[PDB]
Design a protein around this ligand. Structure first.
Ligand SMILES: CCCCCCCCCCCCCCCCCC(=O)OC[C@H](COP(=O)([O-])OCC(O)COP(=O)([O-])OC[C@@H](COC(=O)CCCCCCCCCCCCCCCCC)OC(=O)CCCCCCCCCCCCCCCCC)OC(=O)CCCCCCCCCCCCCCCCC
Ligand SMILES: COC1=C(OC)C(=O)C(C/C=C(/C)CC/C=C(/C)CC/C=C(/C)CC/C=C(\C)CC/C=C(\C)CC/C=C(\C)CC/C=C(/C)CC/C=C(/C)CC/C=C(/C)CCC=C(C)C)=C(C)C1=O
Ligand SMILES: CCCCCCCCCCCCCCCCC[C@@H](O)O[C@H](CO[C@H](O)CCCCCCCCCCCCCCC)COP(=O)(O)OCC[N+](C)(C)C
Ligand SMILES: CCCCCCCCCCCCCCCCC[C@@H](O)O[C@H](CO[C@H](O)CCCCCCCCCCCCCCC)COP(=O)(O)OCC[N+](C)(C)C
Ligand SMILES: CCCCCCCC/C=C\CCCCCCCC(=O)OC[C@H](COP(=O)(O)OCCN)OC(=O)CCCCCCC/C=C\CCCCCCCC
Ligand SMILES: CCCCCCCC/C=C\CCCCCCCC(=O)O[C@H](COC(=O)CCCCCCC/C=C/CCCCCCCC)COP(=O)(O)OCCN
Ligand SMILES: CCCCCCCC/C=C\CCCCCCCC(=O)O[C@H](COC(=O)CCCCCCC/C=C/CCCCCCCC)COP(=O)(O)OCCN
Lengths: 347, 70, 98, 175, 113, 105, 83, 115, 114, 318
């Protein structure tokens, strides 16, 4: 792809997201979603191969079905009230259809099936974009209509997302599928607290985005997409594996690391609403994500795997391209728990 | 050819005359002989319906002048 | 609501079921997607005409526009799929697992 | 009540939708979508929207022509399927026809809430507005307002169409 | 080469001038018949008000006759909380009338060609 | 989530199209202009939670204008009673509801 | 100065259709901003009375509002007749 | 109502013409007579086999350009608005991007048929 | 919700203007010139009260003024007006521009006599 | 009385098509230094009747590999649409008066292509398939340019009502204001009616008979009746658009005669063009329509949008 065309497509994806997040009219939100998808499809196929084509086709089918459902919900809401403003859905059937469409766009269970496959089929940069930037628009729409959502359906989908993310991640040797299942579990955590407090949803989104950016940048730096490929990194860049191990511990939510702060803030919030069973189950299930993060850390940094002879040649060369925001991303992914009260600036 | 093509053209022209003249004559025959009313907008349709109501014989083209207001 | 509104909503539901229930050809699914767009156009047009909301007389047209984009997008993808396999069968899209 | 022309047109709309959603060969699915587009144009025209119905019919005629070409290129097989050449296709077609019949019966003979709300019938003509004024068409005025009120819509639509050209150029590049 | 283009542009300018004059005249004539409509509008408004009111009154009297046996039915009871005038739905005006004039009031303008 | 750029800049990107009572071309009114105007003026500035309870009358009238469900039910009841009466012959429709009226302009 | 002249000569020799298209499109873009009759078109559009002119209630403080259509006050379409 | 009657009349006339064509003449149909025509000989393959399209990119581009027709047909009514300066800017802007998209496809060899 | 109050059939009665639309179009300019005051009063009532039941007497005055206008025309010269509106009535779109001679005669008559 | 009008429209159109076959044969003959049909009837006046009687008494064959339903539906669709195209045309009064008559013509013309597509596909023969795919390519070539040309031309009419075109051209033919557009419009009609040099879906010298190679007898005759009716209809539409005949409301026969003469001139011009030029290649038609006609059409659309505003000459009737 031409670099100018690539920049235009990236800016069109971003413009679709901004259109979604600045619009007060349902039609403009729908248009933002369409523009985002249209510009997003070629970015997934930037490195042409059969796997990228299959991933793009699956992604487009999922998102186009979700867009059809979303427009149907908009039209039903308009039918039962001549309203185009995104405030609060006036028809419960329209609200259910809108919630399902947004869950399908986000990849929440049971509409999670496409998230691993697509993430496996594209490059690491495309996966970074797909797992960080593509969540902003549906989550913003969900935040705007939070009072209208039926708590039972949303909480069922959130609990299913956490459970399925943990269980699916337990079985993976490929790093992109691991990141996808991690993403599904984190999305469940985000959508669980949405009916109670949208500021907690935003805080969780920011923290997850920071840690996901750190991990994808570390995986691009050590160009590894499998566990065994990542097991060679200690013999070329030990600092990278150490930083990856600390970031993995943070993603598992262990204190005093940053990844603990969202869950801690969510469970607590839920207890203000007389919700104890769901937070208890949520934490006990996030233990599974911690388990497969720990397994990756075992294979990558805490032990030393056998290497190859040709690695000696790689000892003689440095990394040509430097990532400016990787150090800030790692520090933000690990050492921000003492600044927890700053979350008040998010409301 | 050359003027032996002309009879075919004459037959074609005679056939093509019939639609327009027939439409004009049928419009005059079914509209009191005065060029069937055109209703492109609802105001013209309202005028036609009012004419039909005030005709007394349920026909808009029946026109009432100053002799109908005693 | 009138029988026509429920008929249009039923048409949308039928097209969505057709999309969700796959057969071999991807083109058939693309046709189901276009049918969903058509039903949405008809329903929104009927509502906007019935309520005499003048300024949304333009939104179905814009709707149509983005429909075209989807169609174009889908057709593009189909071409690539065919160029890989010689068929547009959805069975061939099984390189990626869960 | 009033000749139920619109009800017949909507029923044919549903029938064509079932025709293409049972998914025979895309030749017949395209034909079914063309029939649905025509009857939908008729439905919209019966409610005063001449421009919208005609334009959606024209757009879908063009789209189905492109789909026919693409079907001949990439969606053919030795024996293309019709609605009676396959047990699955025939079953889907008959099931759709019968469940349409069930909805119509249960809606017109008694009043029930199918999924969202209820219906009694009374024909479409009841919900009309009987407004009497104007040397113009309100639909045409609302559509033409796109160039004075809908500047933002024009901007985003034109950008999306240009980007769509670039996108289809990128996707089919290969390499 | 030069002569052909010169004749073409000359013809185009002559046509533009002629059509400019004719279209300005057409705009003036349209303003004139719009003014005729504006002058006629109040009479049509008065007659339409009387016609709608009479149809509603006849429906009210017939409904009073018909619904005298039903126990808990209020004659002429509104369905709106507000007491201001609501423009009658055409179904209410022609509810108790024959099919042909209902087809008229519904589809006469659309079907007129 | 919602970065409210329009009100900050006074841009009006899409607010002209959100409601039925907002500045139509050639001053063409919506079918339910008065009801929506009343409901909007009732609910302005008091918040959604309070508006759902304290403007229920205006919103119900607006919805009745939009869908006309109560009107259709009432017309159906009147028609059913008329049909029941006519079948037994107790009630006879008048000439002006059978096509024999004296029309007026 | 001379480079653009040579480019135009080459384009006129090889692709006259594109040259004509670009010239016509450029004129269509630029000429309306320099025309004195655009404002006349706007005024003609605003002079078309699609809907009824609703009268204003007299409050005794309306010197510029006519009491009758033929009264001298109000807008005048004299400029339109002579056009 | 008149248009429906017109459509019914035209379709009925064509259908009766087909009926007359199939029921008036003497029919002598045999397998050799009804076999596929390929100028003297039996076809090698099936006519239902895939037939490659060399103008596939232009066909997709036609879909996007056909909806530009939808956006420009309300132009005669748009010329009647009071703020002509805004509509002319938006009408010209929409035609400029259509010209730019055609220019982009033309320069990137998109209008050339596949070899 | 309350009972909708409707006028009786007796007070909805008025002397109707029973001339066709072509006659009205032919007379419209002078009609809007002469009968301006009651028409404007009625239309002000109409857009202020937003209720047809509250502007019935003004509508009756509109009818009465229109009837007086047409009676005066019938009294002074009916033949020029009759030819004018017949010419107007022939047109399917009822065009003013196709009947300028008859319009000129009618205008000269109403100017000289009235 | 409306059915009488339907008949008085459709039957004379069929007779005009029948005798247009003779007129084209004789015109090509005399342009080829021969006479053409002059034996079957005086000056060949009975040749169309003999051709029709021969075709409708000949055996129609149903191909073994064909799909019978579309095979029968396609000629019916072709002929019925060809007849339907005539109902909004004002001569000077239309049978059906529409606000958007131009859009109705566009939509029905776009639908008529499916007759050729479905006949070619349901024939289940290779040459018919090649003809159908050429029809796909031809529509892709001409549709956008034809629509934009029509919009640019109608910007001076003020609406899509066909009868208004009579009022627009009361003092000057519209071809004097838009002769470039008319030029392309004419060529576009040649491509739209599948006429030489753009008779690619037929292509006698390339694909024996193209899409209708498997058709015989009555349905075959129906396809030609549809094609020739479309030729006459498109030329009449062009005459209405660009050669405005003065109409007198009290003597409409003068308008009818003038209109018929102009339509005959345009049809004879089509026959002349067929006699004069070789056939295009079907990719060359696409390149002609997309690289020459489309840019000029876009520029002229811009110009015809700006011109009424620049000169304060916007037409009435929003
Ligand atoms: C509701 C329920 C369904 C209603 C169906 C409508 C009525 C059609 C049913 C009869 C057709 C099938 C007969 C047959 O197979 O051959 C008979 C017989 C058997 O031939 P065979 O060689 O022995 O066996 C061949 C094999 O069996 C197989 O041979 P085959 O491959 O040729 O068979 C295919 C055929 C077999 O049929 C089936 O597979 C099942 C039938 C279901 C068809 C419905 C699909 C939905 C499509 C959209 C909805 C359409 C509206 C439906 C509502 C109707 C009320 C209006 O399916 C079709 O292709 C039928 C297509 C009909 C669509 C017509 C639309 C015209 C398009 C014009 C443009 C539209 C403008 C915009 C509006 O052969 C003949 O006698 C000659 C053919 C007769 C055809 C005449 C014209 C076609 C029928 C009229 C169509 C409706 C016009 C209105
Ligand atoms: C260069 O050689 C060639 C020619 O030149 C010699 C041709 O002409 C030519 C075209 C074929 C011709 C021989 C024309 C064939 C004549 C028609 C097919 C007959 C059509 C006549 C009827 C079907 C029309 C309807 C008949 C009725 C009498 C009309 C009224 C209808 C009633 C219902 C009333 C070809 C392909 C050709 O190649
Ligand atoms: C803050 C950052 C600025 C730079 C980045 C901007 C990014 C977005 C791109 C452009 C933003 C457009 C925002 C302006 C919205 C237009 C509406 C508003 O400005 O008024 C309109 C002004 O319209 C003007 O014509 C300006 C539009 C010109 C813009 C067209 C080209 C520029 C777009 C370039 C970027 C888009 C993508 C790339 C395209 C090639 C119409 O006003 P008017 O009609 O009087 O009155 C309306 C009220 N009425 C109807 C009741 C009477
Ligand atoms: C321009 C368009 C409009 C024109 C207006 C007229 C429309 C005419 C409709 C089209 C049909 C006319 C075709 C002309 C020939 C008739 C074809 C058929 O109907 O006749 C025979 C019909 O016969 C049937 O097969 C059996 C006869 C009886 C069947 C029972 C039907 C009920 C009749 C009961 C009789 C009792 C008295 C009835 C009269 C009061 C078929 O014989 P068949 O050999 O297969 O097919 C070949 C026909 N050939 C021989 C002429 C070549
Ligand atoms: C096929 C599609 C046909 C399209 C028909 C469009 C005709 C049209 O445009 O005329 C519009 C005309 C008048 O409107 P205007 O003049 O623009 O303004 C109103 C003021 N007089 O409107 C009408 O009369 C509408 C009447 C109903 C529309 C007709 C619907 C026909 C649908 C065909 C269904 C046939 C059976 C279904 C399947 C067919 C084949 C299996
Ligand atoms: C400011 C207003 C702009 C808007 C108006 C334009 C409306 C629509 C017109 C543009 C439509 C799309 C244009 C497509 C561009 C084509 C690009 C291209 O590929 O060019 C080459 C050809 O190169 C050219 O572009 C030709 C010359 C350069 C472009 C044409 C001239 C540019 C402007 C010239 C006129 C400027 C104004 C007139 C000045 C008059 C004197 C004062 C194509 O040839 P090939 O097919 O590749 O060759 C293979 C077979 N031989
Ligand atoms: C003050 C501002 C005014 C605005 C500008 C106005 C002046 C505009 C000046 C230019 C106008 C030219 C319009 C013509 C459009 C087409 C020109 C063209 O270039 O097309 C040809 C091709 O077009 C054709 O020649 C058509 C071929 C088929 C011909 C069929 C029959 C010929 C026509 C017979 C007579 C036509 C009569 C039409 C009018 C009918 C009345 C309605 C290009 O193809 P090539 O020569 O191969 O070169 C390009 C690639 N290298």
């Amino acid at each position: 792809m031409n670099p100018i065309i690539y920049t235009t497509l990236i800016m069109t994806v971003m413009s679709g997201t901004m259109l979604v997040m600045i619009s007060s009219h349902w039609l403009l939100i729908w248009i933002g979603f369409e523009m985002n998808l249209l510009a997003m499809i070629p970015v997934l196929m930037k490195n042409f191969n059969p796997r990228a084509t299959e991933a793009a086709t699956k992604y487009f089918l999922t998102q186009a079905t979700a867009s059809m459902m979303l427009m149907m919900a908009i039209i039903i809401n308009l039918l039962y009230s001549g309203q185009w403003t995104i405030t609060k859905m006036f028809n419960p059937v329209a609200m259910t259809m809108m919630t399902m469409a947004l869950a399908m766009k986000l990849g929440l269970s049971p509409f999670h099936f496409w998230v691993p496959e697509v993430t496996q089929g594209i490059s690491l940069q495309a996966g970074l974009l797909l797992l960080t930037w593509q969540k902003l628009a549906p989550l913003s729409v969900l935040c705007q209509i939070s009072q209208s959502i039926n708590p039972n359906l949303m909480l069922t989908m959130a609990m299913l997302s956490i459970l399925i993310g943990g269980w699916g991640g337990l079985n993976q040797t490929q790093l992109r599928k691991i990141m996808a299942y991690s993403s599904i579990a984190h999305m469940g955590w985000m959508t669980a607290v949405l009916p109670y407090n949208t500021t907690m949803t935003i805080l969780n989104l920011l923290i997850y985005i920071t840690m996901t950016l750190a991990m994808f940048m570390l995986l691009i730096h050590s160009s590894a997409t499998t566990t065994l490929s990542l097991s060679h990194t200690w013999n070329k860049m030990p600092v990278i594996t150490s930083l990856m191990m600390v970031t993995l511990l943070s993603m598992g939510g262990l204190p005093p690391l940053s990844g603990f702060m969202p869950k801690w803030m969510i469970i607590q919030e839920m207890t203000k609403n007389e919700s104890i069973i769901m937070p208890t189950l949520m934490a006990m299930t996030a233990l599974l994500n911690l388990y497969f993060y720990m397994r990756l850390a075992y294979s990558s940094s805490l032990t030393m795997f056998p290497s190859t002879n040709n690695m000696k040649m790689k000892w003689q060369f440095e990394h040509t391209k430097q990532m400016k925001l990787l150090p800030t991303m790692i520090v933000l992914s690990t050492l921000v728990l003492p600044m927890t009260p700053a979350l008040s600036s998010l409301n | 050819m050359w003027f032996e093509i002309l009879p075919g053209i004459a037959v074609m022209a005679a056939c093509l005359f019939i639609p327009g003249m027939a439409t004009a004559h049928i419009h005059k025959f079914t509209n009191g002989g005065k060029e069937k009313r055109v209703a492109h907008f609802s105001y013209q349709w309202n005028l036609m319906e009012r004419d039909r109501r005030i005709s007394g014989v349920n026909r808009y083209h029946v026109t009432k002048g100053l002799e109908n207001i005693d | 609501m009138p029988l026509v509104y429920m008929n249009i909503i039923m048409a949308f539901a039928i097209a969505l079921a057709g999309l969700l229930m796959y057969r071999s050809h991807l083109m058939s699914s693309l046709l189901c997607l276009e049918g969903m767009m058509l039903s949405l156009f008809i329903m929104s047009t009927l509502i906007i005409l019935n309520t005499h909301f003048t300024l949304a007389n333009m939104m179905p047209i814009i709707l149509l526009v983005f429909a075209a984009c989807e169609a174009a997008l889908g057709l593009s993808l189909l071409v690539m799929v065919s160029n890989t396999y010689g068929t547009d069968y959805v069975q061939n899209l099984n390189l990626l697992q869960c | 009540m009033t000749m139920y022309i619109a009800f017949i047109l909507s029923t044919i709309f549903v029938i064509g939708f079932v025709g293409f959603s049972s998914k025979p060969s895309p030749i017949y699915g395209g034909l079914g979508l063309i029939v649905s587009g025509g009857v939908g144009c008729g439905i919209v025209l019966n409610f005063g929207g001449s421009f919208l119905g005609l334009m959606v019919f024209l757009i879908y005629l063009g789209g189905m022509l492109v789909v026919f070409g693409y079907t001949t290129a990439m969606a053919t097989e030795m024996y293309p399927e019709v609605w009676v050449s396959n047990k699955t296709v025939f079953g889907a077609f008959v099931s759709g026809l019968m469940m349409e019949f069930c909805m119509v019966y249960y809606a017109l003979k008694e009043e029930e809430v199918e999924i969202i709300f209820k219906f009694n019938g009374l024909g479409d003509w009841v919900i009309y507005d009987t407004g009497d004024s104007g040397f113009f068409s309100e639909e045409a005025m609302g559509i033409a307002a796109l160039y004075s009120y809908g500047t933002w819509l024009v901007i985003v639509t034109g950008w999306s169409l240009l980007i769509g050209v670039v996108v289809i150029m990128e996707i089919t590049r290969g390499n | 080469g030069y002569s052909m283009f010169a004749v073409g542009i000359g013809t185009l300018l002559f046509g533009y001038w002629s059509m400019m004059k004719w279209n300005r005249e057409r705009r003036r004539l349209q303003i004139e018949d719009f003014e005729a409509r504006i002058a006629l509008m109040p009479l049509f408004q008065a007659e339409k008000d009387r016609r709608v009111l009479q149809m509603l009154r006849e429906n009210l009297e017939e409904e009073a006759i018909i619904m005298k046996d039903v126990p808990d039915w209020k004659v002429g009871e509104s369905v709106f909380h507000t007491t201001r005038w609501v423009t009658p739905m055409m179904g209410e005006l022609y509810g108790l009338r024959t099919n042909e004039e209902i087809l008229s009031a519904t589809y006469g303008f659309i079907w007129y060609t | 989530p919602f970065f409210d750029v329009q009100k900050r800049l006074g841009l009006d990107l899409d607010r002209w199209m959100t409601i039925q009572s907002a500045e139509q071309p050639h001053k063409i009114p919506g079918r339910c202009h008065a009801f929506e105007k009343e409901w909007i003026e009732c609910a302005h500035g008091i918040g959604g939670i309070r508006a759902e309870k304290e403007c229920k009358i205006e919103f119900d009238d607006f919805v009745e204008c939009l869908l006309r469900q109560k009107t259709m039910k009432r017309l159906s009841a009147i028609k059913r009673q008329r049909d029941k009466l006519i079948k037994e012959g107790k009630y006879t429709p008048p000439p002006h509801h059978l096509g024999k009226e004296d029309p007026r302009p | 100065a001379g480079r653009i002249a040579s480019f135009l000569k080459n384009a006129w020799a090889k692709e006259p259709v594109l040259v004509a298209s670009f010239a016509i499109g450029g004129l269509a873009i630029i000429l309306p901003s320099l025309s004195p009759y655009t404002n006349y078109a706007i005024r003609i559009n605003r002079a078309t009375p699609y809907n009824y002119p609703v009268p204003l209630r007299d409050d005794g403080n309306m010197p510029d509002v006519p009491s009758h259509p033929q009264d001298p006050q109000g807008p005048s379409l004299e400029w339109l007749k002579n056009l | 109502m008149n248009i429906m009657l017109t459509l019914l009349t035209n379709v009925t006339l064509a259908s009766l013409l087909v009926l007359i064509a199939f029921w008036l003449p003497q029919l002598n149909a045999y397998s050799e007579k009804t076999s596929p025509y390929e100028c003297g000989f039996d076809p090698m393959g099936s006519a239902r086999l895939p037939f490659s399209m060399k103008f596939f990119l232009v066909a997709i581009t036609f879909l996007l350009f056909d909806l530009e027709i939808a956006l420009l047909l309300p132009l005669p009514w748009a010329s009647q608005t009071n703020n002509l300066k805004t509509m002319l800017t938006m009408a010209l802007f929409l035609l400029i991007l259509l010209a730019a998209s055609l220019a982009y496809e033309w320069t990137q060899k998109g209008l050339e048929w596949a070899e | 919700p309350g009972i909708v109050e409707l006028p009786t059939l007796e007070d909805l009665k008025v002397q109707e203007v029973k001339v066709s639309s072509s006659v009205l179009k032919a007379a419209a300019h002078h009609y809007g010139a002469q009968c301006d005051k009651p028409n404007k009063e009625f239309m002000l009532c109409r857009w202020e009260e937003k209720d047809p039941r509250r502007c019935l007497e003004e509508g009756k005055l509109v009818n009465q003024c229109a009837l007086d206008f047409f009676r005066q025309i019938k009294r002074h010269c009916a033949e020029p007006f009759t030819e004018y509106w017949t010419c107007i009535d022939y047109s399917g779109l009822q065009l003013f521009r196709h009947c300028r001679k008859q319009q000129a005669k009618f205008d000269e008559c109403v100017l000289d006599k009235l | 009385m409306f059915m009488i009008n339907i008949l008085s429209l459709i039957i004379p159109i069929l007779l005009a098509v029948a005798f247009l076959t003779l007129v084209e044969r004789k015109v090509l003959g005399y342009m080829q230094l021969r006479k053409g049909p002059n034996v079957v009837g005086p000056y060949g006046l009975l040749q169309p009747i003999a051709d029709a009687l021969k075709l409708f008494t000949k055996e129609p064959l149903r191909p073994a590999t064909s799909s019978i339903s579309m095979f029968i539906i396609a000629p019916i669709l072709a002929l019925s649409l060809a007849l339907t195209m005539w109902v909004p045309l004002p001569m000077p009064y239309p049978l059906i008066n529409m606000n958007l008559g131009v859009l109705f013509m566009l939509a029905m013309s776009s639908l008529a292509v499916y007759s050729i597509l479905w006949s070619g596909w349901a024939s289940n023969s290779k040459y018919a398939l090649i003809g159908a795919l050429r029809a796909v390519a031809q529509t892709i070539s001409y549709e956008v340019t034809l629509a934009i040309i029509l919009l640019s031309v109608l910007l001076m009419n003020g609406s899509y009502t066909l009868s208004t075109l009579i009022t627009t051209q009361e003092h000057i033919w519209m071809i004097f204001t838009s002769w470039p557009l008319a030029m392309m419009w004419f060529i576009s009609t040649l491509a739209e009616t599948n006429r030489a040099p753009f008779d690619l879906t037929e292509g006698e010298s390339e694909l024996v008979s193209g899409f209708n190679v498997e058709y015989a007898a009555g349905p075959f005759a129906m396809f030609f009746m549809a094609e020739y009716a479309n030729i006459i209809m498109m030329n009449a539409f062009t005459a209405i658009l660009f050669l405005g005949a003065s109409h007198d409301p009290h003597t409409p026969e003068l308008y009818t005669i003038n209109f018929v003469l102009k339509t005959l001139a345009l049809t004879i011009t089509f026959l002349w063009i067929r006699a004069s030029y070789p056939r295009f290649r079907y990719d060359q038609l696409m390149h002609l329509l997309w690289k020459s006609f489309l840019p000029l059409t876009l520029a002229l659309c811009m110009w015809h949008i700006s011109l009424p505003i620049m000169t304060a000459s916007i037409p009435p009737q929003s």
